[PDB]
User: Fold this.
Amino acid sequence: QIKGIAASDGVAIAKAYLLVEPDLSFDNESVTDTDAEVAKFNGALNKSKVELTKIRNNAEKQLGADKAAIFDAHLLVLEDPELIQPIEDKIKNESVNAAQALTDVSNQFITIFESMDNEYMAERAADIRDVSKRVLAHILGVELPNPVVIIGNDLTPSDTAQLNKEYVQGFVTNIGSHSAIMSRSLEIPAVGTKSITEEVEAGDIVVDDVLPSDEVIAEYQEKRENFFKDKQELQKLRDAESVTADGHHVELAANIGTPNDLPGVIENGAEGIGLYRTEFLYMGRDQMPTEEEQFEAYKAVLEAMKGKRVVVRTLDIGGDKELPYLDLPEEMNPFLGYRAIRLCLDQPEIFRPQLRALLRASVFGKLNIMFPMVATIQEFRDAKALLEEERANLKNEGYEVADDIELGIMVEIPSTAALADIFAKEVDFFSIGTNDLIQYTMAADRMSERVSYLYQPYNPAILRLVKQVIEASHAEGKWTGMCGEMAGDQTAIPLLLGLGLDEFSMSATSILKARRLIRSLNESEMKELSERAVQCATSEEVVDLVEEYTK
Amino acid sequence: QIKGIAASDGVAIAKAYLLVEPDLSFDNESVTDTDAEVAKFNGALNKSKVELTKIRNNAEKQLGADKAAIFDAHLLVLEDPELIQPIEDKIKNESVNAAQALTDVSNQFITIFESMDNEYMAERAADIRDVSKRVLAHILGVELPNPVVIIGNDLTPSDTAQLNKEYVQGFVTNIGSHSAIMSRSLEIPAVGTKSITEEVEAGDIVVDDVLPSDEVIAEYQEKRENFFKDKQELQKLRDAESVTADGHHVELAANIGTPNDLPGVIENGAEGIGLYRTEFLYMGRDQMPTEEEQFEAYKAVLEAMKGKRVVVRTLDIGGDKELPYLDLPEEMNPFLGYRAIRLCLDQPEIFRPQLRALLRASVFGKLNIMFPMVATIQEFRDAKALLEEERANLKNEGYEVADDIELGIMVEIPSTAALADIFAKEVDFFSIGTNDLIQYTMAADRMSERVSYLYQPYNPAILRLVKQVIEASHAEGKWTGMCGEMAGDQTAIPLLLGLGLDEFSMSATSILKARRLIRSLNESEMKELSERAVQCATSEEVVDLVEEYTK
Assistant:
């Protein structure tokens, strides 16, 4: 029973392996029948060759290709006549046994090859030493490791590969890395010991380190069908609908910041993209991104989502970021200054390329465009007018532009929530960016440590502003989404459901667990939780109410 | 008709003065009756002395005291025998007239005294030259200036004082200072000319520069009874109530930042102090202010207001300010960080001295304590608990502490407005600090130029948050005040009245004009203006509605 119960999964229950290198010690004896001694050596030699030729071929046809070149090198050594002949001649002319004959001759090679200090000649001496050990073991009749719950002294980042990952089930508990690496990589169990070298015999274990009992072999056995159970039923929801137990439907979209995030979107079952952050196109470069370059990236995503909603956020950046082209002064409170839509409306030369590209990409999918940092109705109107201006420009140039592009704002500035009903008439949708709404509403820097205690996503104040935005959009027949981390928060989800949020958008690695929660919930019950939640005074009271309705 | 119609008031209509130095040129003649010529000189000498002795005495008994020492010096010169005798001897022995005799002898003195380069010997030569000119004028029979609408070539910061400020009514239009200074200082009119030296004769003007017409002398005459009319009826409201034409009562308090602001509070008719900023006690020093020092300053004001409400704001400061004692890190967005109540609750060693002093000072007047930057209900509760803790401490030490000290928060963080109804139960009052509420609600730095266009006090969003705070306090039987510049804004006042704000607090120099506006208004009509105002979409629409209801 050791520790280090991490690095990988749990519950293994298999045999063993013990990669401990056997005792290949021998006494330098003298032989009577040298011919027999030479045949003995030649027999171990060939046995080693068929062994290697089996290891090689059975490494490529599994999971090697490039891992199968060390064995061909191992094999090349054994074909070297300048190695074999000296051994045989020693057996004959010196009348010593094969074991020492092999060792003596191979040692000389090891000696000469390491004193060359070449990165390869030291590799050669390493191959000789490695294969010489194989023949020698055959020569002495000692069965050595080769391709169960593996267990070894150290952590070989080369030895742990020979075995077939298939039968290589269970775990691999050593004693402290090269072990904890493939531990989680092979998706197996682990459980960094020390005195594990004296556990069970060669027969044997149970990862989770228990080894055996034959009694409590049922507890962990079903505890395994509890680990795979969750992971399986979870991924099974990949295509399942996002519906509450009582039939209430919601959409679970993903937040991405690059077309490279697309694979994670599909493998998690997102129902669309609620936030396509576009800063990656502008940050880390010396020139602004061209219309054509942005077009390609918007179109790629629109098309890849096959008609699913894709909400692109126009440039949301300010002076606190590098940006060599463009000259943004220092600023005392950048989060309260010249940034996002303020910068874009003030510098249309950086905004037009983005709007033209979006407009052009709109024909390849279901595109929604949202503006960040809008504080006033006139700012939305100016942005929209500029979008319409380039719309007309694109048509007079022959380009096709989708006519039903929904325009919204990302609610983050409190004044925007205070006027929800007014914006709800001119806008097509709202998307609550709680990361910044919490910040501005609590007047606490989302990145500051000294005041992080005021960054309260569950505070009644936040819930109330979220509610008036949602209710304001529904009254005008529109919808409201959320792309702030809150939307993927297990504690917030129950509340958002009750409040009536239409679409939740989050990192792809959260949709599944979120879909699970949403299914095991009653909207009628969540609605009640939210009505009381917005009547609380503190965040703690809100939390207590959520742990209550989600017992 | 010149220009420069500023520097002072308007509408004068008086005589003239023309301080132009007369022509004191004379021809060096020869005299027959030297005795008569000496008596002539002696006659001008004595006439000058009684003239000066009159100027001296009639300078102290008016507005001089320290201005009456130049004349005694002027007089001391004329008593100097080393000056007189040489003149007389010249008249007798050289047989030349007094004019040249005086000039010649005085010149020598001027010569000798200026070549000494002393700051005083040059002052002596200046006195001689100045008084020598007086005798000489008498000697030639030339009436010179002495103590109407003054007019002169230059701007003498010494000549313009001889005349009695009483008869010195009207203005003083020169040609370009030493003129524009006392222009507004004497509260007279002005109207920086150039070719004004050739205006009206010695008889004569009308400041406002018209001079005379005897026809349009009625227009400006009543236009004067329009200037003094406003200024008079305005100060008459010093003791008048702050009531709307239809009987709605409100309080007009003052905002101060030091006991030295007290005189302006009384002379403007403030009905109390709505904001006593306490930063002055902490800024610009190397040690924190002691309890005793703060006590003295709070008590002084409490007592001086004779039972009128005095709302003290606890320390409202953050890292963006010097503050040598205390160590506040750099911070990227200080307005969104460690400051005000956040700093005080985190460093009670700086907060307790302030609360103890306030508690102690409470027995000398009607004190209200309000906390700044409160964002959460728990922050108010923690501040209150700490106040109660020192309350108990002070009583167990023998100090007296008023039991009815009202506790409130300065609403500036949006979350605070979103939860108005909750705070309205635990707090005694609210005081809207619109300077920062506008900033956080519009997410625009109150001090930043590039985004000042978003600092919109009349934006519907701001009006709505103000309204929900006021309505929330009234429902709990409490009151709401406002100390942001908005409360003293002529455009905002009509709206605040309609919204039902109980107390307006502003710089003392605004209460009068504000009281005027409030009186010439119908609350029932203002209430209607506000209901529509909170239904607008833009600031411009709000403004248009105010110019409409205040035609």
